[PDB]
Amino acid sequence: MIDLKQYEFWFLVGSQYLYGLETLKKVEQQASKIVDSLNDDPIFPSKIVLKPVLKSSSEITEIFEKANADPKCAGVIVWMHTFSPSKMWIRGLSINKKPLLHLHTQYNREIPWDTIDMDYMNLNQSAHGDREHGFIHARMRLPRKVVVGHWEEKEVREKIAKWMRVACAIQDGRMGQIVRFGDNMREVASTEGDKVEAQIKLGWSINTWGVGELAERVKAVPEREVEELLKEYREKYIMPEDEYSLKAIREQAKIEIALREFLKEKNAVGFTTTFEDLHDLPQLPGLAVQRLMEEGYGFGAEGDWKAAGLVRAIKVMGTSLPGGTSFMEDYTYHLTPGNELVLGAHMLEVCPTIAKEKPRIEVHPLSIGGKADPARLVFDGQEGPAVNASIVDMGNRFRLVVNKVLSVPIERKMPKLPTARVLWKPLPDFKRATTAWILAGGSHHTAFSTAIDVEYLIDWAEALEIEYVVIDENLDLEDFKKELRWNELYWGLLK
Amino acid sequence: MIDLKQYEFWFLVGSQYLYGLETLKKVEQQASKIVDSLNDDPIFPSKIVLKPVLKSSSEITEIFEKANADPKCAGVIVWMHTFSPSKMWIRGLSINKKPLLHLHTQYNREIPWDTIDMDYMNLNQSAHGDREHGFIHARMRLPRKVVVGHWEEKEVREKIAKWMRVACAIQDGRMGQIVRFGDNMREVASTEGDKVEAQIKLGWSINTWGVGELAERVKAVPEREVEELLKEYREKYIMPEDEYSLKAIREQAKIEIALREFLKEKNAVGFTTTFEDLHDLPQLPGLAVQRLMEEGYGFGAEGDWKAAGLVRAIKVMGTSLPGGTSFMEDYTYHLTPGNELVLGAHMLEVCPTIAKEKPRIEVHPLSIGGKADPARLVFDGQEGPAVNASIVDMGNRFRLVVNKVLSVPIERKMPKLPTARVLWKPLPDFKRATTAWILAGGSHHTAFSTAIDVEYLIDWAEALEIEYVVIDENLDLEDFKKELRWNELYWGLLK
Amino acid sequence: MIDLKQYEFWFLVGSQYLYGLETLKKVEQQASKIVDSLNDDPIFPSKIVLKPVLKSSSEITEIFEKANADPKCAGVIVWMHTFSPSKMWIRGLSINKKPLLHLHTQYNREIPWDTIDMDYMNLNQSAHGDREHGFIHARMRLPRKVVVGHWEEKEVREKIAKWMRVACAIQDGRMGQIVRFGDNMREVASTEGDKVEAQIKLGWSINTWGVGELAERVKAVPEREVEELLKEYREKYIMPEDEYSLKAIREQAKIEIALREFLKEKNAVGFTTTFEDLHDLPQLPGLAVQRLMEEGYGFGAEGDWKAAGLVRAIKVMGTSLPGGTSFMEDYTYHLTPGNELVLGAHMLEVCPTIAKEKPRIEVHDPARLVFDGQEGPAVNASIVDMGNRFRLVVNKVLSVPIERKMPKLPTARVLWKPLPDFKRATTAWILAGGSHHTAFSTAIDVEYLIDWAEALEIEYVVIDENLDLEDFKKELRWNELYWGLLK
Numbered sequence A, B: 001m002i003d004l005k006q007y008e009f010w011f012l013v014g015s016q017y018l019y020g021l022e023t024l025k026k027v028e029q030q031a032s033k034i035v036d037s038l039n040d041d042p043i044f045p046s047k048i049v050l051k052p053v054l055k056s057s058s059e060i061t062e063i064f065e066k067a068n069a070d071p072k073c074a075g076v077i078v079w080m081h082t083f084s085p086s087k088m089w090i091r092g093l094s095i096n097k098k099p100l101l102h103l104h105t106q107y108n109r110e111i112p113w114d115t116i117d118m119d120y121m122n123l124n125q126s127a128h129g130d131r132e133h134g135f136i137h138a139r140m141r142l143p144r145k146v147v148v149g150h151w152e153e154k155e156v157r158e159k160i161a162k163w164m165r166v167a168c169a170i171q172d173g174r175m176g177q178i179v180r181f182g183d184n185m186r187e188v189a190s191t192e193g194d195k196v197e198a199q200i201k202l203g204w205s206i207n208t209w210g211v212g213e214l215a216e217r218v219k220a221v222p223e224r225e226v227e228e229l230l231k232e233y234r235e236k237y238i239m240p241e242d243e244y245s246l247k248a249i250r251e252q253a254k255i256e257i258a259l260r261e262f263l264k265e266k267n268a269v270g271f272t273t274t275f276e277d278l279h280d281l282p283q284l285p286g287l288a289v290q291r292l293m294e295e296g297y298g299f300g301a302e303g304d305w306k307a308a309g310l311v312r313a314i315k316v317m318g319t320s321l322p323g324g325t326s327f328m329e330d331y332t333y334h335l336t337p338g339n340e341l342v343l344g345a346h347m348l349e350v351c352p353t354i355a356k357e358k359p360r361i362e363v364h365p366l367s368i369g370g371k372a373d374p375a376r377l378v379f380d381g382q383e384g385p386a387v388n389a390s391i392v393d394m395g396n397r398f399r400l401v402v403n404k405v406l407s408v409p410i411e412r413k414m415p416k417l418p419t420a421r422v423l424w425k426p427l428p429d430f431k432r433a434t435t436a437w438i439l440a441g442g443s444h445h446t447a448f449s450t451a452i453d454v455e456y457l458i459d460w461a462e463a464l465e466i467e468y469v470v471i472d473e474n475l476d477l478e479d480f481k482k483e484l485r486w487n488e489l490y491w492g493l494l495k
Numbered sequence C: 001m002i003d004l005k006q007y008e009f010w011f012l013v014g015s016q017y018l019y020g021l022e023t024l025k026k027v028e029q030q031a032s033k034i035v036d037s038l039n040d041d042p043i044f045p046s047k048i049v050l051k052p053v054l055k056s057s058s059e060i061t062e063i064f065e066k067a068n069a070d071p072k073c074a075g076v077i078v079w080m081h082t083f084s085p086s087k088m089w090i091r092g093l094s095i096n097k098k099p100l101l102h103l104h105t106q107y108n109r110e111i112p113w114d115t116i117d118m119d120y121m122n123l124n125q126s127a128h129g130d131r132e133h134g135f136i137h138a139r140m141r142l143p144r145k146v147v148v149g150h151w152e153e154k155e156v157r158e159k160i161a162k163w164m165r166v167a168c169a170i171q172d173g174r175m176g177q178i179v180r181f182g183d184n185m186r187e188v189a190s191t192e193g194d195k196v197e198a199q200i201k202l203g204w205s206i207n208t209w210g211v212g213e214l215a216e217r218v219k220a221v222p223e224r225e226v227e228e229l230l231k232e233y234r235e236k237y238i239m240p241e242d243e244y245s246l247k248a249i250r251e252q253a254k255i256e257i258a259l260r261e262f263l264k265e266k267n268a269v270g271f272t273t274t275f276e277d278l279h280d281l282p283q284l285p286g287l288a289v290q291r292l293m294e295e296g297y298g299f300g301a302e303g304d305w306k307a308a309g310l311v312r313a314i315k316v317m318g319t320s321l322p323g324g325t326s327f328m329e330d331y332t333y334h335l336t337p338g339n340e341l342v343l344g345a346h347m348l349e350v351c352p353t354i355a356k357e358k359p360r361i362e363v364h365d366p367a368r369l370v371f372d373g374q375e376g377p378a379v380n381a382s383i384v385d386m387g388n389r390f391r392l393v394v395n396k397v398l399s400v401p402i403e404r405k406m407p408k409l410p411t412a413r414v415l416w417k418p419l420p421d422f423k424r425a426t427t428a429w430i431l432a433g434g435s436h437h438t439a440f441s442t443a444i445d446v447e448y449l450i451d452w453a454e455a456l457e458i459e460y461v462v463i464d465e466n467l468d469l470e471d472f473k474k475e476l477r478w479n480e481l482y483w484g485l486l487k
């Protein structure tokens, strides 16, 4: 249970010393009235601090210098109520490395056709005000998200909420670390990337340990805790009775505790493992990974820290009741000429946030990583639209491929499927989407989410200055190619 | 009449040692069950050779090192039946320069919802398998067409068979020569190019001979050959009776013998001439040129070796009955407000393969290249959708301008047009499709084709890594103007 | 003790069909006369397999196809006895991914001033022949090493020989694998890199194994073999008497065998460990890594697979008797204004190939080898991942004898003066962003690494005695474009 309400977004209001101290107080008053009314609408999942109205050059850098310092400040929102000369913003936007939202709004909705004097016009210069401020953004190449509309209107409140989550997700990643029990699966390429380029460009701290450091913890678990976890299990899951099924549940319980004590110690947010390197671990970690991920931790099997750190960040976005974000691996295809589906699952680890019903603890024999039959949760995937993403290292940079999909109800049950499953249509056609994915060269290790819109992932790349490529219903393949080889240069040398 | 049944494409399947030794046989059985059913389908104009399951790096390089060696292996198909670590593939794909198709498929259409156990999941890891292997093509920038679908379904088979025809038209381009009889027409630009760059980029070996080398062949022709062809002419064409008309036919026959002896001697695929440099040649080459093209020999006029090499490369694609590729020069227009057509012809040379009626031999005096009145075939053009291609050299690189056309039947006869004619509407509008053609700067010397779709040329430029610019029905004049300046960069520095 | 005399270097000759059928045989016989005496010279450590004189455009590919297909072919030498038009070479050079030498020689030394008819001039069209063949190498941007000189004159023989040693060090890397035990030291950056970008560029397959996988090998070692190494330790090294000292030797013995068996089991050229993951391992690898490095295996500590893969590649270049290459780590500094030295060593692992005297075994528990640094000129190098690309920083140094012994230094030490000044060389090394983990070689000269990087199309930056610092900054920033967007 990791939340994001502790995070605050600094609202920033613009004018200049070269104005009457009466109208500057009229915008201070006016802005206050906006954020007061804003912070009361529960669509926003974090605070909005309203800092003094910025007139001077020095006041710009000041507020920024402090906004970069403060670990609770997950983003900035900038809005010029009156004309703010922007050559005051430069030395402030030079020093600011936090996500930007440009909110292009005007306190009053309608034009007072009988009360629009120079007195008022001077107060509400908002129309031109943050066009001048809009250029200096574009002219500096600063990454930001411009949004136009009255704060009264909800559609704009939606757009800024999508950003807020994404902006706070980024910090829960720059702050966070990725724990790696052992390195990648041997001779695998997609899972692999530049550990250094991730800390430079995403701020993703990432460190590898031995598996023997985890094994020393799993054998050291108080026995009176594991039975106090099995009494919580019975409240949700648990197999018929005690057997060789429930010896695995007591083994995964003493694995779950050993991680959670380890993941706090190293400032972790997303971890990763490997199924061919589980020495001194009496069982493959399975039910222990599904529980941790339920709490919010990012995960990626076969050492894949890209997917792990993506699951984490896209988890942090998917807080709202529409909730639903897992770690997915496209395992098999339905190729029926009209309904070309794709069954999404893994060898074990599917997050129960996308569980349509009560997740069912099951144990089945599996040869992969020759050790005791592990426990796992079984449940039919959630219907309704979703997104499937994947970050992948292109040597010099990263790219984010994202497949908008339409999760369909599971039409036939599966008596011999041990893993929880999901069924979806890769939009538009499965051929066009999955041809585009591979053209782009996404990881096999993908990031499923039922919570979040595609827009979220677009704002995420936009605010980290990396390529993103969207597999929408409006997917021309010939167009997508041209996009791939055009993008390649922009993000390649420039940034 | 060079066919391509001789040409073979290598079917490569990927796994890893880190599996049961007997499931690798299960893949061996299963791949065979595919490529055997595939080769029994006669849409594929070349053979397919299944090679043993690839598990180790060693095997990946050892197959690829051979795939460049065998001159009849004109491309490789690649599909991962299970998860195949791509770092195995790097040294292999690093070394490969034969066109790639990435077949993404699954041996069974539907998922056995009641019999899918972890032993079966392990066997068909085909979904997440060639995503991972997909990434290594994207990250190493390796040019390849990817295709997705089930090897049963005809859509996927369509794509791969249109690639095959293209990949073997590349090998019948690198392998062959271009034989010129004189340089380029004086002061003509789009016909000129770097005959050296061609060989580095396209492999097109190209050289130039004198005209007197041909003159020494036309005078040394046995008189029992010119009359053995005439008896084969009468079987198809021939002008009414013995007259000054049937003297031109006995001059084109010996030119066809000389040309034949030359191009076979030089292992030629295309050739090119010039109407201002034919010294010691009693007559301008024409009916002989049109006869050589009816076999499959490429040709350009005015020295055009760009057009000459395309005609061939697009000829080799068109072997099957739909056949119909020529050598075109957009001659005149019908600027009628509704039905804006274009009349593609030449001073003489147009390939009969596009004829819709019996080619009629005709002789008419023409002032282009001072010498005796040459013989030509006169016929109506073939109706139906066609494409009008032109390569041309932009210093650093080449681009492929392809104007899909809708070839209409000729409404009225022309009792005063000497040369065989064609009438089309350049899609979409004549104005758009031309105003775009001139923008992309297409050669006037094009390669008309009523055999192939745009599909072929796109797979071509894709595989050779050159700029392609299509003139679709979807042609947003401005959008095209943005494509030309964006593509500029990509194909300039990178490639 | 992995050799490179198996490797063959295909000598390619250039003529055209468009010649008298006779003269082509005088090119074949004359080339045969060149390589026959050439192979006879022992300065070349790898064979030379002359291949039929190449006239046709088709023959050029065929040999290059053969040249990429044969694993033991680790280079191609080229020389155009007569004028060989280059547009025959294009389709063949395109398909070639094996290091290239353009030899520019003439079978006769002098010009027979009295006897130089067109019948001879048209046979030794060697000058303008490979002058025309040079352009196409320049035009396509193909990597190759151009040499000039009559085959008899030892100077050119050297220049090609160093290439040979380089090229075969490349092929013992494209074929080889780098075995990591554990990842890099946590939060360390110069060790870290793009594992997949390296296989592409440097051909180095690289994969990691959990440290546990090794421990199962060291515990399963026959105890009656670990003595069979102790018996061979006694033939060269060993500590005074049976003591805890020797339980640290039996524990390094049983680590070396396991490393041997594990680095045999896979076609492994270089390896790497880390000191903060050795769970289930009863000791830190030290002696057992110095022994293996003495044989030829490349090593880097704290996971550094970059320094590891270089040490291997630069160990294969170092084969001849002037041998001496070790995995170095510049530890401390003597700052004395006149004799500005540096005391290179490591936490443990220093290769005994640069040993002046008898290597002594010392246990301080990790077991080391105590020996002085080999004097005279050497080279220090480091490969580092600039994210997009790679760069190889190489610092020429003048290793000096050690003036006073150190009774309380457990690790083997090497003293050297980084050329020109200590200030310049080191300021430059840091500007260029060299790894702390280096490859120290007394065996080879700069020349080797220059022809290595040139051959792999990666930036190299030299710290010569001719090191203008200002000019070096400008040289860093101008290199970063070329190796950036282009390669």
Ligand SMILES: [Mn+2]
Pocket: A301, A302, A329, A444, A445
């Ligand atoms: Mn996986």
Ligand SMILES: [Mn+2]
Pocket: B301, B302, B329, B445
């Ligand atoms: Mn013309």
Ligand SMILES: [Mn+2]
Pocket: C301, C302, C329, C436, C437
């Ligand atoms: Mn170190």
